Amino acid sequence: NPQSKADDILQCARTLIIRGGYNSFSYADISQVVGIRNASIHHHFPSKSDLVCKLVSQYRQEAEAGIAELEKNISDPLEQLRAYIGYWEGCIADATHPFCVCALLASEIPVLPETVVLEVRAHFRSLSDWLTAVLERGIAQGRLVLTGTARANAEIFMATVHGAMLSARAHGDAATFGAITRPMLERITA
Amino acid sequence: NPQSKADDILQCARTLIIRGGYNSFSYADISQVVGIRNASIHHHFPSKSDLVCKLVSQYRQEAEAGIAELEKNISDPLEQLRAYIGYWEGCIADATHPFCVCALLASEIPVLPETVVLEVRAHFRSLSDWLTAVLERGIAQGRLVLTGTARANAEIFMATVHGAMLSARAHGDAATFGAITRPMLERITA
Numbered sequence: 001n002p003q004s005k006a007d008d009i010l011q012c013a014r015t016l017i018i019r020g021g022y023n024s025f026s027y028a029d030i031s032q033v034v035g036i037r038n039a040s041i042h043h044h045f046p047s048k049s050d051l052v053c054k055l056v057s058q059y060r061q062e063a064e065a066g067i068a069e070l071e072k073n074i075s076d077p078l079e080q081l082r083a084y085i086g087y088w089e090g091c092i093a094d095a096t097h098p099f100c101v102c103a104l105l106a107s108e109i110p111v112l113p114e115t116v117v118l119e120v121r122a123h124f125r126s127l128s129d130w131l132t133a134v135l136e137r138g139i140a141q142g143r144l145v146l147t148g149t150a151r152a153n154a155e156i157f158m159a160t161v162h163g164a165m166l167s168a169r170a171h172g173d174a175a176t177f178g179a180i181t182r183p184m185l186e187r188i189t190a
Numbered sequence: 191n192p193q194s195k196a197d198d199i200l201q202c203a204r205t206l207i208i209r210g211g212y213n214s215f216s217y218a219d220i221s222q223v224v225g226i227r228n229a230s231i232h233h234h235f236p237s238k239s240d241l242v243c244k245l246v247s248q249y250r251q252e253a254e255a256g257i258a259e260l261e262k263n264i265s266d267p268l269e270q271l272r273a274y275i276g277y278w279e280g281c282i283a284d285a286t287h288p289f290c291v292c293a294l295l296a297s298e299i300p301v302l303p304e305t306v307v308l309e310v311r312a313h314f315r316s317l318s319d320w321l322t323a324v325l326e327r328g329i330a331q332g333r334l335v336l337t338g339t340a341r342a343n344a345e346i347f348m349a350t351v352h353g354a355m356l357s358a359r360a361h362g363d364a365a366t367f368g369a370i371t372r373p374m375l376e377r378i379t380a
Contacts, residue, residue, distance in 0.1 A: 020301030023213035099297070106360040107289070107297045111210030124361040148373060155357065156350070159370045163353030167345065170296040171314040180349045183338060 006044045008034045010055050018099050021108050022052060022116070049113035052105075056119040059101045063123065067130055077138035078189055081131075081157070085181050088161065092168050092177050099169060103162040128154050135188075144188045157184060196234045198224045200245050208289050211298050212242060212306070239303035242295075246309040249291045253313065257320055267328035268379055271321075271347070275371050278351065282358050282367050289359060293352040318344050325378075334378045347374060 012033045016025035027041045027048070045051035067084060074080045092098040102123035109117055131154035138144030146153050164180035167173075202223045206215035217231045217238070235241035257274060264270045282288040292313035299307055321344035328334030336343050354370035357363075 020213060020298045021211060023210060024298060024301045103356065104297050106356050107294050108210045108214060109359050111214045121361045124357065128361070147377070152369060152373070155366070156370050156373060159353030159357050160346070160350055161353070162356050163349030163351070166293065166296050166352050166356075167314065167349050169299050171311045171318070176345070179342060180346050183342070183346060187337070 002044075005034075005036060005040065009036070009041060009044055009051065010058060013051055014055050014059060014101065015097065017052070017055065017101055018097050018104060021104050022112055023108070049115055052113075052116050053119050056101060056105070056116065056123070060119065060123045060126065063100075063102075064126065064130075067127075071130075071134070076143055077134045077141060078143050078185070080134050081138075081185055085161075085178065085185065088165065088181075089174075089177055092165070093174060099165050100162065103165060106162075124158070128158055131157055138188075143190055145190050146188055153188070157181075160184060192234075195224075195226060195230065199226070199231060199234055199241065200248060203241055204245050204249060204291065205287065207242070207245065207291055208287050208294060211294050212302055213298070239305055242303075242306050243309050246291060246295070246306065246313070250309065250313045250316065253290075253292075254316065254320075257317075261320075261324070266333055267324045267331060268333050268375070270324050271328075271375055275351075275368065275375065278355065278371075279364075279367055282355070283364060289355050290352065293355060296352075314348070318348055321347055328378075333380055335380050336378055343378070347371075350374060 009030055012030050013025065016029055016033075019025075027038050030036075030041055031038055041051075045054065066087065070080050070083045070087070074083055102120045105112060105116065105120045106124065109120065112120070128151070132151045135144060135146065135150035135153050135157075139146065139150065160181050164177045167180060168176040199220055202220050203215065206219055206223075209215075217228050220226075220231055221228055231241075235244065256277065260270050260273045260277070264273055292310045295302060295306065295310045296314065299310065302310070318341070322341045325334060325336065325340035325343050325347075329336065329340065350371050354367045357370060358366040
């Protein structure tokens with residue numbers, strides 16, 4: 001049915017966009033993977049900008065649901081940050097989606113449609129908000145020690161994660177991501 | 191003359207690639223800026239992969255010459271790292287080239303030509319080598335204090351720089367880059 005074809009197009013486009021960003025895939029590539037013709041893609045999504053806004057909105061919904069599940073299941077804020085690091089290490093291992101869609105698109109902001117840029121920036125502010133709240137709970141519970149504010153530390157940890165994803169993709173390697181991100185976690189442990 | 195046209199094409203392509211990466215510009219865009227026709231671009235560069243390898247090799251030559259000049263002019267290793275941070279803050283201010291060509295291309299590695307990937311990875315290993323040597327001199331001179339090895343700290347600082355460039359481009363802002371990168375520098379000051 002129609003819904004399943006729309007889901008297949010979004011699945012496919014998400015995998016392609018993680019390889020090379022907004023301009024690295026075409027509707028022809030989606031036809032090659034999913035088997036629908038070009039005109040059919042347009043019935044589902046009236047433009048590529050709309051397809052990518054829909055993909056990023058779904059990616060954020062899933063990203064927020066996954067860090068919420070960490071927050072729910074894990075009592076200690078430090079262990080929530082450690083489990084978030086572990087989640088990305090598993091994604092880089094599985095190698096299907098070894099990069100954050102929004103971090104990748106952020107590097108291309110100046111050429112992206114404005115509607116896509118809105119979705120990408122919303123993920124950054126939202127992830128920063130989550131990390132800020134986890135760090136604040138860690139202070140409130142005497143589980144962490146910080147220099148500077150929780151928000152400033154959240155912004156450093158998010159930048160370190162995005163830079164570590166980039167180093168793992170570049171000069172190689174399944175231990176890079178942890179080797180870069182974990183020392184902060186051990187620093188801030190009370 | 192011929193050389194000047196080749197330089198103009200590389201200048202133009204460097205500015206375009208910093209906006210959106212490898213797939214965000216075409217030879218038509220270069221013709222629009224530089225005024226040569228499509229066939230003329232091909233006389234200078236037999237393929238787009240070759241044009242981009244030439245651009246990245248020139249960008250690295252310049253990047254290495256600039257950090258070498260820091261190293262030459264500045265005696266204290268900590269002040270060499272602080273001046274490197276300042277160099278990127280000035281680039282983000284001037285807004286012409288507010289992102290590293292190689293950091294941007296690294297996010298697209300899976301779709302890049304292999305010859306381009308070689309040049310991008312060479313920049314990462316080389317910048318990591320430079321930062322490692324600056325950190326080692328800082329230890330040898332009693333100017334810095336590190337947890338873990340100099341190379342592991344170099345890899346964190348390079349990832350923090352690349353992640354900070356990304357946050358400055360994303361959820362906005364000429365103070366983000368320093369706000370993320372400078373706390374490390376003050377941490378490691380002896």
